[PDB]
Amino acid sequence: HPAYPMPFITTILGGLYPSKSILLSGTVLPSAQRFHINLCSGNHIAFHLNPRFDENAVVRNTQIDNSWGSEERSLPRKMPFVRGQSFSVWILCEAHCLKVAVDGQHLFEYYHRLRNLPTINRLEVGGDIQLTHVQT
């Protein structure tokens, strides 16, 4: 299995809705600094999942136009993403929030800030990883 182009952008026909799942698998580059997964709506980023190896954190936020909201960084356990290590991310959309699991284990919830779920119809992946698979 080769690699997807990076950054990778693709439409999510129908957008989001309760029970909607988006899966991604890949490998964090050996000296990765950061990478991100965005769920977009028009010119806004409804959900920005941003693991950072330089800060050893997983940042989540929303951007309306060019205005970033308040970041959410809480984690129930140690940073699950590791440089040079393969990973899988599962994003499950519920009515009130997104539930995110990494490597098969739930990591956090993100309450919807952009609530018109069907309008969240674009996925963007960028940064320091080798993207090997996406299931929209």
Ligand X SMILES: CC(=O)N[C@H]1[C@H]([C@H](O)[C@H](O)CO)O[C@@](O[C@H]2[C@@H](O)[C@@H](CO)O[C@@H](O[C@H]3[C@H](O)[C@@H](O)[C@H](O)O[C@@H]3CO)[C@@H]2O)(C(=O)O)C[C@@H]1O
Binding site for ligand X (CB under 6 A): 36, 48, 50, 59, 61, 68, 71
Q: Write down the least CB distance from residue 125 to ligand X, Å.
A: 12
Q: Please indicate if the annotation marks 62 as binding a ligand.
A: yes
Q: Write down the least CB distance from residue 18 to ligand X, Å.
A: 26
Q: Write down the least CB distance from residue 27 to ligand X, Å.
A: 21
* 3-state percent helix, strand, coil for the chain, nearest multiple of 5: 0, 55, 45
Q: Which residues contact 22 (CB under 8 A, 6 or more apart)?
A: 12, 39, 90, 91, 93, 123, 134, 135, 136
Considering all CA atoms of the chain, what is the largest pairwise distance in Å, rounded to the nearest integer?
Answer: 38
Q: Please indicate if the annotation marks 94 as binding a ligand.
A: no
Cβ proximity to ligand X, 40 vs 107, nearer residue: 40
Tokens of 122: 């674009």
Cβ proximity to ligand X, 20 vs 51, nearer residue: 51
Cβ proximity to ligand X, 7 vs 84, nearer residue: 7
Q: CA 56 to CA 61: how far, in whole Å?
A: 16
Binding residues for a beta-D-galactoside: 48, 52, 62, 68-74
